[PDB]
Structures are given as structure tokens and as C-alpha cells.
Amino acid sequence: VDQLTNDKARVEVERDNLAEDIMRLREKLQEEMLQREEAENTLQSFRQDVDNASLARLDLERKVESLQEEIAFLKKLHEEEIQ
Amino acid sequence: VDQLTNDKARVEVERDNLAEDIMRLREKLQEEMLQREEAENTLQSFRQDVDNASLARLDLERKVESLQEEIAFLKKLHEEEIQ
Amino acid sequence: VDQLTNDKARVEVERDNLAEDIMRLREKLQEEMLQREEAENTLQSFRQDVDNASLARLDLERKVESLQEEIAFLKKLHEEEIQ
């Protein structure tokens, strides 16, 4: 009457193999997570870099204009007054 | 003769647990997808930022050269002509 | 006495479906991997871009100072000597 010895062995084999595939995908998944987590950090550092670059490039543009004004005045001074 | 009541219960337990692990990996996977999708967007914005920075840094380099030329002429004017 | 024909069919159905879910998650996982791998490359190119931008923005700041010095000397020359 009783009969479950060969069936539970089949379930065990199919379970083992399915577990192995789930295992590999999990390990790959964890690997991608750490990678994209460090990528997020590198992303932050990049964002902080471009803004500071935008600040210093602004200070340069303003000082360049200052040089342009002072030169234009040097040009409207010694060349066209009395002579 | 008939016998499948205890076997289908074993399959059900192993199925439930395998489904749970597949479930968690799926949720983590979806989480990584949204994260890397927003990272792709931040990547685009960064690319657009560095090119525009490269355009304005070019306009500055050209105008700096212009200042250098006009100064060099101011220096070759009032100091070394007649006096 | 013998009895495993209907049980192995149940295991087969549950196996097929679990395999299908594992299959999809695997394909999504592979897709995220290639995406984050190319993102890593774009990350490298960005890093190389910001440093070179930092080098040229430095050369500009130094030359701007040079222009400031030469102008300040042009201003302390023709306006306040003998006249």
C-alpha cells in the first residue's frame, strides 16, 4: 500500500538543480548590486566635480571680462587724447 | 492501489520555498533596474554638461589669446617707438 | 503496488513553470549586466574628461593671472611716472 520512496527522490533532484540556478542568479545579482552601488558613489563625485568646474569657469569668465574692460580703456587712453 | 496524497504535499512545500527565493531575487532585480535606469539618465545629463563645459572653456581660451595679442601690442606701442 | 506515474507528472509541471520564471529573471539579469558594463565604460570616459577639463581650466587661470599682472604694469607705467 505505502509508496513514496522513488517520488521524493525525484523531487529532491529537481529541487537541487533548480536551487543551483537560483543560486547562481543570486550571486550575479549581488555582484551587480555592489557594482551599481559604487557606480552611484562615482556618480555623486562626478556631479560635485562638474558644479565646482562650473563655479571656477564662471570666475574665469568674469575676470576675462574685467581684463577686456581694462584693456579697452588702455586703448582709449594713450592713443586718442591730445598727442 | 491509489497513492499520491503525501507526495503532492512534498512537491507543494518545495515549490512554495523555491517560489519565495525566486520572488526575492525578482524584487531585487526590479530594484536594480530602476536604479540603473535613473543612472542612465544621470549619465546623459553628465554627458551634456561636459560638452557644454568644453564649449565655454573654448570660448575662454580664444578670448584669453585675444587679450594676449592686444596686451602684446600695448607693450610694443608706448615703450618702443620714438620717445 | 507500483505507483509514480501521476506524481512525476506533477513534479514536471511545477518544474517547468519554476524554470520559466528563473529563465526570465536570468535574461533580465544578463540585460542589466551588459547595461551596467557599458555604464562603467561611460563612467571611465567621464572621469578622463573632468580631469583634462581641470588641467585646461588651470592653464587658463594661470594665464589670466599673467594678463592681470601685465595690465597692472601697463597701468602703473604710462599714467604715473613723469608727465
mmCIF file of C-alpha atoms in Angstrom:
data_model
loop_
_atom_site.group_PDB
_atom_site.id
_atom_site.type_symbol
_atom_site.label_atom_id
_atom_site.label_comp_id
_atom_site.label_asym_id
_atom_site.label_seq_id
_atom_site.Cartn_x
_atom_site.Cartn_y
_atom_site.Cartn_z
ATOM 1 C CA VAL A 1 0.000 0.000 0.000
ATOM 2 C CA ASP A 2 2.553 2.608 1.109
ATOM 3 C CA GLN A 3 4.524 4.322 -1.785
ATOM 4 C CA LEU A 4 6.654 7.493 -1.757
ATOM 5 C CA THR A 5 10.334 6.416 -1.820
ATOM 6 C CA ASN A 6 11.065 6.955 -5.510
ATOM 7 C CA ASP A 7 8.890 10.062 -5.815
ATOM 8 C CA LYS A 8 10.583 12.046 -3.046
ATOM 9 C CA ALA A 9 13.916 11.270 -4.689
ATOM 10 C CA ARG A 10 12.727 12.779 -7.969
ATOM 11 C CA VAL A 11 11.506 15.902 -6.176
ATOM 12 C CA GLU A 12 14.894 16.072 -4.452
ATOM 13 C CA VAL A 13 16.813 16.009 -7.743
ATOM 14 C CA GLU A 14 14.639 18.653 -9.413
ATOM 15 C CA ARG A 15 14.865 20.752 -6.251
ATOM 16 C CA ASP A 16 18.668 20.510 -6.129
ATOM 17 C CA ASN A 17 19.092 21.672 -9.727
ATOM 18 C CA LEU A 18 16.535 24.492 -9.504
ATOM 19 C CA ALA A 19 18.270 25.637 -6.327
ATOM 20 C CA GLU A 20 21.596 25.711 -8.171
ATOM 21 C CA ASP A 21 20.265 28.011 -10.903
ATOM 22 C CA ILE A 22 18.597 30.246 -8.344
ATOM 23 C CA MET A 23 21.930 30.246 -6.501
ATOM 24 C CA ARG A 24 23.966 31.492 -9.472
ATOM 25 C CA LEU A 25 21.456 34.192 -10.380
ATOM 26 C CA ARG A 26 21.506 35.358 -6.780
ATOM 27 C CA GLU A 27 25.303 35.634 -6.769
ATOM 28 C CA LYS A 28 25.288 37.528 -10.060
ATOM 29 C CA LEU A 29 22.543 39.753 -8.683
ATOM 30 C CA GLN A 30 24.557 40.564 -5.550
ATOM 31 C CA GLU A 31 27.571 41.317 -7.778
ATOM 32 C CA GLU A 32 25.586 43.771 -9.905
ATOM 33 C CA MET A 33 24.270 45.431 -6.743
ATOM 34 C CA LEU A 34 27.697 46.215 -5.307
ATOM 35 C CA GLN A 35 28.827 47.397 -8.753
ATOM 36 C CA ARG A 36 25.903 49.768 -9.259
ATOM 37 C CA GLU A 37 26.254 50.933 -5.657
ATOM 38 C CA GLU A 38 29.844 52.017 -6.249
ATOM 39 C CA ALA A 39 28.689 53.491 -9.557
ATOM 40 C CA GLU A 40 26.196 55.590 -7.603
ATOM 41 C CA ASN A 41 29.096 56.893 -5.495
ATOM 42 C CA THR A 42 31.185 57.683 -8.567
ATOM 43 C CA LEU A 43 28.094 59.420 -9.944
ATOM 44 C CA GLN A 44 27.942 61.667 -6.860
ATOM 45 C CA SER A 45 31.620 62.553 -7.131
ATOM 46 C CA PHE A 46 31.139 63.412 -10.789
ATOM 47 C CA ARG A 47 28.172 65.680 -10.003
ATOM 48 C CA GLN A 48 30.213 67.512 -7.360
ATOM 49 C CA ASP A 49 33.059 67.857 -9.879
ATOM 50 C CA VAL A 50 31.028 69.446 -12.707
ATOM 51 C CA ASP A 51 29.402 72.050 -10.425
ATOM 52 C CA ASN A 52 32.708 73.149 -8.956
ATOM 53 C CA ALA A 53 34.074 73.271 -12.509
ATOM 54 C CA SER A 54 31.099 75.442 -13.382
ATOM 55 C CA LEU A 55 31.933 77.813 -10.496
ATOM 56 C CA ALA A 56 35.583 78.275 -11.441
ATOM 57 C CA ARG A 57 34.777 78.616 -15.121
ATOM 58 C CA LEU A 58 32.411 81.412 -14.061
ATOM 59 C CA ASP A 59 35.030 83.204 -12.005
ATOM 60 C CA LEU A 60 37.278 82.995 -15.096
ATOM 61 C CA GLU A 61 34.667 84.397 -17.480
ATOM 62 C CA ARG A 62 34.067 87.348 -15.135
ATOM 63 C CA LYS A 63 37.764 88.108 -14.741
ATOM 64 C CA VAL A 64 38.256 87.794 -18.505
ATOM 65 C CA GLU A 65 35.596 90.483 -18.962
ATOM 66 C CA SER A 66 37.473 92.592 -16.387
ATOM 67 C CA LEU A 67 40.637 92.246 -18.460
ATOM 68 C CA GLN A 68 38.699 93.214 -21.583
ATOM 69 C CA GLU A 69 37.399 96.390 -19.936
ATOM 70 C CA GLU A 70 40.804 97.459 -18.586
ATOM 71 C CA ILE A 71 42.449 96.815 -21.967
ATOM 72 C CA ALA A 72 39.754 98.711 -23.853
ATOM 73 C CA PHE A 73 40.438 101.629 -21.510
ATOM 74 C CA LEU A 74 44.196 101.329 -22.082
ATOM 75 C CA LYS A 75 43.382 101.519 -25.780
ATOM 76 C CA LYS A 76 41.119 104.571 -25.404
ATOM 77 C CA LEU A 77 43.723 106.377 -23.319
ATOM 78 C CA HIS A 78 47.206 106.743 -24.825
ATOM 79 C CA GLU A 79 46.241 106.658 -28.488
ATOM 80 C CA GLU A 80 43.315 109.146 -28.707
ATOM 81 C CA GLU A 81 43.554 112.101 -26.264
ATOM 82 C CA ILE A 82 45.837 115.031 -27.158
ATOM 83 C CA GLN A 83 49.030 113.847 -28.890
ATOM 84 C CA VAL B 1 -3.778 0.922 -5.044
ATOM 85 C CA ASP B 2 -4.162 4.699 -5.420
ATOM 86 C CA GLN B 3 -1.313 6.815 -3.808
ATOM 87 C CA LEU B 4 -0.416 10.496 -4.301
ATOM 88 C CA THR B 5 -1.626 12.406 -1.204
ATOM 89 C CA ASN B 6 1.675 12.711 0.655
ATOM 90 C CA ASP B 7 3.765 13.196 -2.487
ATOM 91 C CA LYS B 8 1.844 16.196 -3.822
ATOM 92 C CA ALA B 9 2.221 17.809 -0.407
ATOM 93 C CA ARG B 10 6.002 17.451 -0.581
ATOM 94 C CA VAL B 11 6.060 18.968 -4.067
ATOM 95 C CA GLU B 12 3.896 21.796 -2.725
ATOM 96 C CA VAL B 13 6.329 22.611 0.091
ATOM 97 C CA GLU B 14 9.410 22.567 -2.148
ATOM 98 C CA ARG B 15 7.513 24.652 -4.700
ATOM 99 C CA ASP B 16 6.479 27.245 -2.103
ATOM 100 C CA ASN B 17 10.037 27.763 -0.860
ATOM 101 C CA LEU B 18 11.624 27.864 -4.326
ATOM 102 C CA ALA B 19 8.972 30.391 -5.323
ATOM 103 C CA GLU B 20 9.897 32.542 -2.324
ATOM 104 C CA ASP B 21 13.573 32.704 -3.314
ATOM 105 C CA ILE B 22 12.672 33.421 -6.920
ATOM 106 C CA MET B 23 10.341 36.113 -5.568
ATOM 107 C CA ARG B 24 13.039 37.949 -3.599
ATOM 108 C CA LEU B 25 15.552 37.822 -6.443
ATOM 109 C CA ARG B 26 12.904 39.218 -8.758
ATOM 110 C CA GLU B 27 12.193 42.139 -6.422
ATOM 111 C CA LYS B 28 15.897 42.885 -6.045
ATOM 112 C CA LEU B 29 16.257 42.632 -9.812
ATOM 113 C CA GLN B 30 13.438 45.128 -10.406
ATOM 114 C CA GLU B 31 15.061 47.452 -7.841
ATOM 115 C CA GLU B 32 18.418 47.344 -9.631
ATOM 116 C CA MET B 33 16.663 48.021 -12.940
ATOM 117 C CA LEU B 34 15.009 51.246 -11.805
ATOM 118 C CA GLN B 35 18.291 52.310 -10.178
ATOM 119 C CA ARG B 36 20.398 51.727 -13.284
ATOM 120 C CA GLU B 37 17.683 53.340 -15.400
ATOM 121 C CA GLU B 38 17.897 56.562 -13.405
ATOM 122 C CA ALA B 39 21.679 56.201 -13.522
ATOM 123 C CA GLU B 40 21.425 56.136 -17.312
ATOM 124 C CA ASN B 41 19.525 59.439 -17.143
ATOM 125 C CA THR B 42 22.101 60.987 -14.822
ATOM 126 C CA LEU B 43 24.729 59.718 -17.261
ATOM 127 C CA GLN B 44 23.046 61.618 -20.115
ATOM 128 C CA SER B 45 22.874 64.820 -18.091
ATOM 129 C CA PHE B 46 26.549 64.473 -17.237
ATOM 130 C CA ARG B 47 27.492 63.995 -20.904
ATOM 131 C CA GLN B 48 25.540 67.123 -21.862
ATOM 132 C CA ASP B 49 27.276 69.004 -19.031
ATOM 133 C CA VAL B 50 30.877 68.166 -20.016
ATOM 134 C CA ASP B 51 30.370 69.119 -23.686
ATOM 135 C CA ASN B 52 28.851 72.475 -22.833
ATOM 136 C CA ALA B 53 31.713 72.975 -20.371
ATOM 137 C CA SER B 54 34.065 72.162 -23.223
ATOM 138 C CA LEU B 55 32.396 74.824 -25.409
ATOM 139 C CA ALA B 56 32.634 77.612 -22.841
ATOM 140 C CA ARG B 57 36.172 76.678 -21.884
ATOM 141 C CA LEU B 58 36.976 77.033 -25.594
ATOM 142 C CA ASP B 59 35.394 80.456 -25.877
ATOM 143 C CA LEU B 60 37.518 81.442 -22.849
ATOM 144 C CA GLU B 61 40.776 80.131 -24.308
ATOM 145 C CA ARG B 62 40.142 82.066 -27.537
ATOM 146 C CA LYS B 63 39.331 85.303 -25.731
ATOM 147 C CA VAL B 64 42.376 84.847 -23.489
ATOM 148 C CA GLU B 65 44.522 84.677 -26.633
ATOM 149 C CA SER B 66 42.785 87.862 -27.832
ATOM 150 C CA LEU B 67 43.762 89.576 -24.585
ATOM 151 C CA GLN B 68 47.331 88.339 -25.004
ATOM 152 C CA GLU B 69 47.557 89.812 -28.507
ATOM 153 C CA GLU B 70 46.107 93.200 -27.517
ATOM 154 C CA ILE B 71 48.426 93.411 -24.495
ATOM 155 C CA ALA B 72 51.482 92.452 -26.532
ATOM 156 C CA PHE B 73 50.558 95.289 -28.893
ATOM 157 C CA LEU B 74 50.115 97.700 -25.973
ATOM 158 C CA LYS B 75 53.605 96.654 -24.922
ATOM 159 C CA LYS B 76 55.095 97.148 -28.402
ATOM 160 C CA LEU B 77 53.498 100.574 -28.716
ATOM 161 C CA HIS B 78 54.220 103.090 -25.944
ATOM 162 C CA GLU B 79 57.592 101.755 -24.846
ATOM 163 C CA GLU B 80 59.500 101.296 -28.156
ATOM 164 C CA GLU B 81 58.602 103.854 -30.877
ATOM 165 C CA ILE B 82 60.166 107.335 -30.702
ATOM 166 C CA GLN B 83 60.472 108.557 -27.095
ATOM 167 C CA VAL C 1 1.847 -1.975 -5.766
ATOM 168 C CA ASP C 2 3.904 0.240 -8.092
ATOM 169 C CA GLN C 3 2.802 3.978 -8.212
ATOM 170 C CA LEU C 4 4.643 7.033 -9.581
ATOM 171 C CA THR C 5 3.031 7.945 -12.939
ATOM 172 C CA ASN C 6 0.826 10.822 -11.796
ATOM 173 C CA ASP C 7 3.331 12.155 -9.261
ATOM 174 C CA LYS C 8 6.220 12.587 -11.698
ATOM 175 C CA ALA C 9 3.857 14.492 -13.978
ATOM 176 C CA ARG C 10 3.036 16.943 -11.191
ATOM 177 C CA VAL C 11 6.730 17.457 -10.452
ATOM 178 C CA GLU C 12 7.258 18.023 -14.178
ATOM 179 C CA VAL C 13 4.626 20.773 -14.352
ATOM 180 C CA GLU C 14 5.898 22.605 -11.264
ATOM 181 C CA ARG C 15 9.446 22.243 -12.582
ATOM 182 C CA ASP C 16 8.530 23.664 -15.999
ATOM 183 C CA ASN C 17 6.901 26.772 -14.531
ATOM 184 C CA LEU C 18 9.631 27.431 -11.951
ATOM 185 C CA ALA C 19 12.175 27.072 -14.745
ATOM 186 C CA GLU C 20 10.293 29.668 -16.791
ATOM 187 C CA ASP C 21 10.433 32.266 -14.007
ATOM 188 C CA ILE C 22 14.091 31.529 -13.371
ATOM 189 C CA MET C 23 14.587 31.886 -17.131
ATOM 190 C CA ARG C 24 13.083 35.381 -17.346
ATOM 191 C CA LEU C 25 14.970 36.652 -14.305
ATOM 192 C CA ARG C 26 18.173 35.322 -15.819
ATOM 193 C CA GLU C 27 17.559 37.156 -19.098
ATOM 194 C CA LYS C 28 16.753 40.386 -17.271
ATOM 195 C CA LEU C 29 19.857 39.875 -15.152
ATOM 196 C CA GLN C 30 22.073 39.438 -18.222
ATOM 197 C CA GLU C 31 20.493 42.585 -19.712
ATOM 198 C CA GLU C 32 21.285 44.643 -16.610
ATOM 199 C CA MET C 33 24.850 43.312 -16.650
ATOM 200 C CA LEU C 34 25.621 44.481 -20.179
ATOM 201 C CA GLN C 35 23.954 47.820 -19.394
ATOM 202 C CA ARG C 36 25.958 48.449 -16.231
ATOM 203 C CA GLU C 37 29.097 47.249 -18.008
ATOM 204 C CA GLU C 38 28.711 49.897 -20.699
ATOM 205 C CA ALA C 39 27.839 52.356 -17.935
ATOM 206 C CA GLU C 40 31.178 51.528 -16.322
ATOM 207 C CA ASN C 41 32.879 52.419 -19.618
ATOM 208 C CA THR C 42 30.969 55.689 -19.905
ATOM 209 C CA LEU C 43 31.979 56.335 -16.295
ATOM 210 C CA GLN C 44 35.665 55.953 -17.223
ATOM 211 C CA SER C 45 35.329 58.316 -20.171
ATOM 212 C CA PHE C 46 33.637 60.862 -17.933
ATOM 213 C CA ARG C 47 36.429 60.634 -15.341
ATOM 214 C CA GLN C 48 39.050 61.191 -18.048
ATOM 215 C CA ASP C 49 37.022 64.162 -19.322
ATOM 216 C CA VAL C 50 36.739 66.031 -15.995
ATOM 217 C CA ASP C 51 40.470 65.727 -15.209
ATOM 218 C CA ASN C 52 41.515 67.037 -18.598
ATOM 219 C CA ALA C 53 38.963 69.825 -18.139
ATOM 220 C CA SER C 54 40.593 70.516 -14.793
ATOM 221 C CA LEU C 55 44.024 70.766 -16.472
ATOM 222 C CA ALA C 56 42.944 73.230 -19.153
ATOM 223 C CA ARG C 57 40.935 75.297 -16.703
ATOM 224 C CA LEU C 58 44.158 75.525 -14.679
ATOM 225 C CA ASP C 59 46.238 76.656 -17.627
ATOM 226 C CA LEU C 60 43.563 79.332 -18.203
ATOM 227 C CA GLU C 61 43.563 80.558 -14.604
ATOM 228 C CA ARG C 62 47.364 80.897 -14.688
ATOM 229 C CA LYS C 63 47.372 82.788 -17.978
ATOM 230 C CA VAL C 64 44.556 85.028 -16.728
ATOM 231 C CA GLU C 65 46.765 85.958 -13.767
ATOM 232 C CA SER C 66 49.576 86.670 -16.254
ATOM 233 C CA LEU C 67 47.275 89.047 -18.121
ATOM 234 C CA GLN C 68 46.331 90.713 -14.839
ATOM 235 C CA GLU C 69 49.985 91.314 -13.955
ATOM 236 C CA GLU C 70 50.908 92.718 -17.381
ATOM 237 C CA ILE C 71 47.859 95.009 -17.366
ATOM 238 C CA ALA C 72 48.561 96.237 -13.843
ATOM 239 C CA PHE C 73 52.059 97.115 -15.054
ATOM 240 C CA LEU C 74 50.654 98.889 -18.121
ATOM 241 C CA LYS C 75 48.526 100.861 -15.680
ATOM 242 C CA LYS C 76 51.460 101.714 -13.391
ATOM 243 C CA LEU C 77 53.573 102.830 -16.337
ATOM 244 C CA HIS C 78 52.090 105.491 -18.630
ATOM 245 C CA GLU C 79 49.820 107.190 -16.117
ATOM 246 C CA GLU C 80 52.100 107.727 -13.064
ATOM 247 C CA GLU C 81 55.786 108.376 -13.926
ATOM 248 C CA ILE C 82 56.812 111.883 -15.044
ATOM 249 C CA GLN C 83 54.127 113.503 -17.226
#
